[PDB]
Curated annotation (Swiss-Prot), chains A, B:
Its EC number is 3.6.4.10. One of its GO terms (cellular component) is preribosome, large subunit precursor. The gene is AFG2. One of its GO terms (biological process) is protein hexamerization. ATP 1 binds at G245, P246, P247, G248, T249, G250, K251, T252. ATP-dependent chaperone which uses the energy provided by ATP hydrolysis to generate mechanical force to disassemble protein complexes. Plays an essential role in the cytoplasmic maturation steps of pre-60S ribosomal particles by promoting the release of shuttling protein RLP24 from the pre-ribosomal particles. This step facilitates the subsequent release of other shuttling proteins such as NOG1 and allows the transition of the pre-ribosomal particles to later maturation forms that bind REI1. Essential for viability. This is ATPase family gene 2 protein. Keywords: ATP-binding, Chaperone, Cytoplasm, Hydrolase, Nucleotide-binding, Repeat, Ribosome biogenesis. Changing E576Q: Increases basal ATPase activity. Reduces RLP24-mediated activation. Does not affect interaction with RLP24. Prevents the release of shuttling proteins RLP24, NOG1 and MEX67 from cytoplasmic pre-60S ribosomal particles. Changing A528V: In drg1-3; resistant to diazaborine-mediated growth inhibition. It is found in: Cytoplasm. It catalyses: ATP + H2O = ADP + phosphate + H(+).
Length: 735, 735
């Protein structure tokens, strides 16, 4: 009459040996209600995934409640069963025919154990069950050496009639005390891909964000193992961790890894699936799920799509479910206990849509930022996935990996998986079309397939609120020695002299203004400084912050400034400030005025900042208002205009690297002498049509002639009159 | 007590012989629930299709699940029973009266078997059941000569008293070992239209989109037939395929043909019919159907009208049916398994209504897009439609079909079927009203009826995003030789110099500007490019993109840009920019500014487009954005002014082909010299008005008179002024 509906997996206590494979502690009332012999096989429905983990069953001692059961540590580890997943119970399966090979695998080991074997097979098949997808057994004590070792029995040659039963449990039959079928020791293979078991994600599988990953691991590890120190402190641990960022970064992988690696209680929710039309039933279900959550002392609660389940009160009062469930959740979330052990983490797509009451300092004062992967993160992801499918399928040098990673600038791990999948699919289809069903191993993976995948992938993440501009070394950029010394000085002052600035009292001017021709000295200088400094740098455009909605630009500027503070002491930079700055001559809407006032308050409004230094670049000198041109802010000015000879030589030799200089015969000096009146963008375009004039003559060319350079020099006018030079000079002298 | 409602169909396994006609695996409880003899006939409700498929029934072995049923591949083929349709149970009907003919048809072959017949009557009539619409049996082994044949028993002359049953099942009676009347083998007729049984759609039913249907078949067959290679790769092969295009292109028949071309299980939905007033009922049904589809390895999932089921999250937050179903379906789609053998098919008319999060590259990056068929595809579909009922019903020359296809430019396959139906009904009514119920075989189908139906169809809205201009070749366009050289160089550079650009790093300027009079050389050039280059051509009109709705134009621009990018690297042309460029004057709305900044960011902003080429045509270059024309981008400029003497002479020669030049006596050069200030548009206009004046004198004429030409010329002003030419020249000087 009990009619059980859901079951929860539980750890096996007391260790020892016991059954260890077929514990199955279910109350006898459930067994009687299912008209199934207790001394027979059991089932693990776990919602779908046919095979149902046919394992033998036993009985409890009236000490395990019907709501929670156990299904053996090794079985749940092999099946990737998280501790506390939803479970059902159905009719058992018929007996298997026989077992064929049962071959050891020796996972995470180099094998060659010789005397350390001491008849492993006796312990392997001395226990009932032993399912073929694997079995993890601790080493316990094995002569001198201690240590630990794992075994894998995936490889076999047993065929079962029902194709749906992918688990196809195998029986055990050995003769011994304390002849098999053609021995058991045969090579040290890992889990086979013929059955394609679900690979359990490990620590090495995730990475690329070690700075945040280690912090999250510590923040979830120190309360779950050492609560006595926090209780003695009296401040109580924070019970909530908030995760947010661009979609596709894979925030669920971290929680999945820390759930499958840890042996504590793990439960997950589908979001609004529990929520129904009724209110009392949903409230009762919530109380029941939290009751089952905290009834076990070690537990971790995972919530998905908090923004959807907790809509903002002010944003939209749509109806149905609203902020009263949010309030009751907050009330029950403020009072678990003084010490406590249950820790709940939160992952959301966007933070603004989430109710600000949720992320109060008393509950979520720690913030985890998961941004778009950087170049190093892309290196790590490519390397880890290459190591994941090994070099057997294909081999590729590190040069191609670094080139394809340098091509990627705003790509994400989801995008990288899309590229690899499309490359594999294109390789398969090309092989089928051309080679007429040739062996797939020989075809492998080549660079042109990856290039084609890059061409036709068309990712849906072209618009990003945060831009990670690719980094370039100092060789590409050609600058001036005084300019380089100044840039290095103003990037080394706030990061090294901050310790002595306390006793000095000067701190930093924190004001940098950049003005010059639009040809160059606007983005490459920032790229070089970011590359050399090694600090996190973000790029934001002028028109990008502007939006049709009134107040949207204010939220964007406030949130990017908040990210600037949250991303450690670094350097912030604006691509073009000549849009919001004009307010009187350029008229414009009041949104520009509000943004200007907000940024003025943020930089010099009854506050002070020692970590971040604002850098502004403008196209015109006179477009800035008099409010910005005030002593104490942006006092320093850099000419960064018509650079001297050595910068031109550097940029010309960088652009001429592809071409041959010795064969041309030019000394690379007269070109710079005649080009001294040009700018970077027009120099780049000029060398472009010079190459074009070289190429269309007789198609492919590896040599460029002087006549082509002479023709291209007069093709484009200088486009520069000394009016702007005089204006820049008169703007410089008045400062 | 269980009260079953709906059943499912499954193939009979183990092959062999068994029964092959009346398996009907039914559990004993259902047998007792029908209060009828188990050794008697049963029925298949199949939600309609009166007759209810009266077939004999038997029992299962308690292993076969009660929910599903098996009713033999012959009956599935005869009744078009898709693998997974709803099924209903009902009491048996009246006993079969008698059998009359049972004659073999032997379709898809030339018949004339004789030698290897070996008494087919024995095999056909030794099986219990045998329903008269037809028996489909595999060849198995027939002496030496392997291969396979198909037999159809659609022809018969038996009538049953109840007209509700359209199947009128019969019995078998024969004498032999290892009596009917008038033998069995007779004639070679195809499927009879008297009963008009539904026919199974095949690959030959759809044509003209071979490159699309083959790609779809591959994308549904390699991931399903051989998942072992993908499992070995371990790249999580995609499970879903998206079908998109304009309404009426005929995607539903593609889904039906791919569903019935394979014996695997298929799920079919009826749109929002699954939605119920209970919030939990919908999600419960979704998880139930997902689980039942997953626990059978061979399965295909069909999604119809995802736009209605899944609306935009950020656009329509109506309530109840919201993104919660999207979240739960994504959760189900995430981790059902590793290898799998199930694929999902999703089709919708409007990709815009699809939620942006649902359009992601992580595991749904692959796209299958079908557009408006061209003249070749239309001709192929028309000739296939004619061949469907062959020359017996109607006769038409291939030139008539080609002319009809040429006339059809923007039509769709649904419109083509409407044209065919209109022609048929117009012919029927005309023959009836003309000859007082004469036989329909005399009139047949003529080109006049097709033309009348084409005139009377009156298409509602022939507006699309992929405009298909009429094909125009080289001789139809007259222009200067310099422009021809420039266009040849511009089309030759990308395709035959991409490798050189990659080696040199120059890439391409990807900027083409066309400024000139709006008469000619603006759309005629695009029409010429549409055919002479051989590359896919796209034309977007300025007034067309503008609309009353705010933001719809932006969405259309985004959609067309991503479609052009994803389709293939090709030259894209935009017709007229005068409706959006003048934003600095007249107080233009913010939408135009957003469009301009979006195109500026997507053309040359933190990314490059090495495949496609940006081509823009303008009338007034002074109204373009100041921040749009900069050195290094869109640098190429074409004068493309008024046509010269040669171009005007070519236009006159092309337009004069209708009349006779010898009779008129004009040299086709003096008129061009006199008409020097007229661009191509008003040149063809004056030619048309001269022809009008020529034909108003004595109706049809064979030549144009000089007096008529001079009267037409003197009645229309030149419309040109030296000031605009001087302005164009001085603007070209600065470029
Ligand atoms: N670090 C990574 N390594 C490998 N693949 C990754 C990584 N991060 C993301 N992916 C790929 O992106 C896909 C989607 O990522 P995932 O579902 O974990 O992200 P999410 O942001 O939590 O999800 P959602 O898009 O539903 O919000 C994964 O299935 C995987 O293919
Ligand atoms: N290519 C074609 N060849 C022949 N008949 C066609 C073709 N395209 C459409 N038709 C006709 O038009 C009808 C409409 O097509 P159907 O009902 O299959 O919808 P669909 O076009 O796939 O759907 P939707 O309107 O959602 O795009 C077909 O039943 C058929 O009679």
């Amino acid at each position: 009459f009990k009619l059980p509906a859901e079951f929860i997996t539980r750890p096996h206590p007391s260790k020892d040996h016991g059954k260890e494979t077929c514990t199955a502690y279910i109350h006898p009332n459930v067994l009687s209600s299912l008209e199934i012999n207790p001394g027979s096989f059991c089932t693990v429905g776990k919602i779908g995934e046919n095979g149902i983990l046919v394992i033998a069953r036993a009985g409890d001692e009236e000490v395990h409640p019907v709501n929670v059961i156990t299904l053996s540590t090794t079985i749940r580890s092999v099946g990737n069963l998280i501790l506390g997943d939803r479970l059902e119970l159905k009719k058992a399966q018929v007996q298997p025919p026989y077992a064929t090979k049962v071959t050891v695998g020796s996972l995470q080991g180099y094998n060659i154990l010789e005397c350390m074997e001491e008849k492993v097979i006796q312990k392997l098949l001395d226990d009932s069950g032993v399912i073929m997808p694997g079995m993890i057994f601790q080493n316990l004590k094995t002569k001198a050496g201690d240590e630990s070792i794992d075994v894998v029995i995936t490889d076999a040659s047993d065929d079962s009639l029902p194709d749906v039963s992918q688990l196809d449990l195998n029986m055990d039959d050995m003769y011994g005390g304390l002849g098999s079928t053609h021995i058991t020791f045969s090579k040290e293979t890992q889990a086979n891909r013929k059955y394609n078991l679900p690979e359990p994600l490990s620590y090495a599988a995730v990475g690329g964000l070690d700075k945040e990953i280690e912090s999250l691991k510590s923040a979830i590890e120190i309360p779950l193992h050492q609560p006595t120190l926090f209780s003695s402190f009296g401040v109580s641990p924070p019970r909530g961790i908030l995760l947010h960022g661009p979609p596709g970064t894979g925030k669920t992988m971290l929680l999945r890894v820390v759930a499958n690696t840890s042996n504590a209680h793990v439960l997950t929710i589908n979001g609004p699936s529990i929520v129904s039309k009724y209110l009392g039933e949903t409230e009762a279900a919530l109380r029941d799920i939290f009751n089952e959550a905290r009834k076990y002392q070690p537990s971790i609660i995972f919530i998905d799509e908090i923004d959807s389940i907790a809509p903002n009160r002010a944003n939209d009062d749509s109806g149905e479910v609203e902020s009263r469930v949010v309030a009751t959740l907050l009330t029950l979330m403020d009072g678990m206990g003084a010490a406590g052990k249950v820790v709940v983490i939160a992952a959301t797509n966007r933070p603004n849509s989430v109710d600000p009451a949720l992320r109060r300092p008393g509950r979520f004062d720690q913030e985890v930022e998961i941004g778009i992967p950087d170049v190093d993160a892309r290196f790590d992801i490519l390397t880890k996935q290459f190591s994941r499918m090994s070099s057997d399928r294909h081999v590729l040098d590190s040069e191609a990996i670094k080139y394809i990673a340098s091509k990627t600038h705003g790509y994400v791990g989801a995008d990288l998986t899309a590229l690899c999948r499309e490359s594999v699919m294109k390789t398969i289809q090309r092989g089928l079309g051309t080679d007429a069903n040739i062996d797939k191993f020989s075809l492998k993976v080549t660079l042109k397939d990856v290039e084609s995948a890059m061409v036709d992938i068309r990712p849906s993440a072209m618009r990003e609120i945060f831009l990670e501009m690719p980094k370039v070394y100092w060789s590409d950029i050609g600058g001036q020695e005084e300019l380089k010394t100044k840039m290095k000085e103003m990037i080394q002052l706030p990061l090294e002299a901050s310790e002595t600035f306390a006793r000095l009292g000067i701190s930093a001017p924190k004001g940098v203004l950049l003005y010059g021709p639009p040809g160059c000295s606007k983005t490459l200088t920032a790229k070089a400084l970011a590359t050399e400094s090694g600090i996190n740098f973000l790029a934001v455009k002028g028109p990008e912050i502007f939006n049709k909605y009134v107040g949207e630009s204010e939220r964007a500027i406030r949130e990017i400034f908040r990210k600037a503070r949250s991303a450690a002491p670094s350097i912030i930079f604006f691509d073009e400030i000549d849009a919001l700055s004009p307010d009187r001559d350029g008229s414009s809407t009041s949104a520009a005025n509000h943004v200007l006032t907000s940024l003025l308050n943020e930089i010099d409004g009854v506050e002070e900042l020692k970590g971040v230094v604002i850098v502004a670049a403008t196209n015109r000198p006179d477009e800035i208002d008099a409010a910005l041109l005030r002593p104490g802010r942006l006092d320093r000015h850099i000419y960064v205009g018509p650079p001297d000879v050595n910068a031109r030589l550097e940029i010309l030799k960088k652009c001429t690297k592809k071409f041959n200089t010795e064969e041309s015969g030019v000394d690379l000096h007269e070109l710079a002498d005649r080009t001294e009146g040009y700018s970077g963008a027009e120099v780049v375009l000029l060398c472009q049509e010079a190459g074009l004039a070289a190429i269309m003559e007789d198609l492919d060319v590896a040599k460029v002639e002087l006549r082509h350079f002479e023709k291209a020099f007069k093709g484009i006018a200088r486009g520069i009159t000394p009016e702007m030079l005089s204006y820049y000079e008169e703007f410089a002298l008045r400062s």
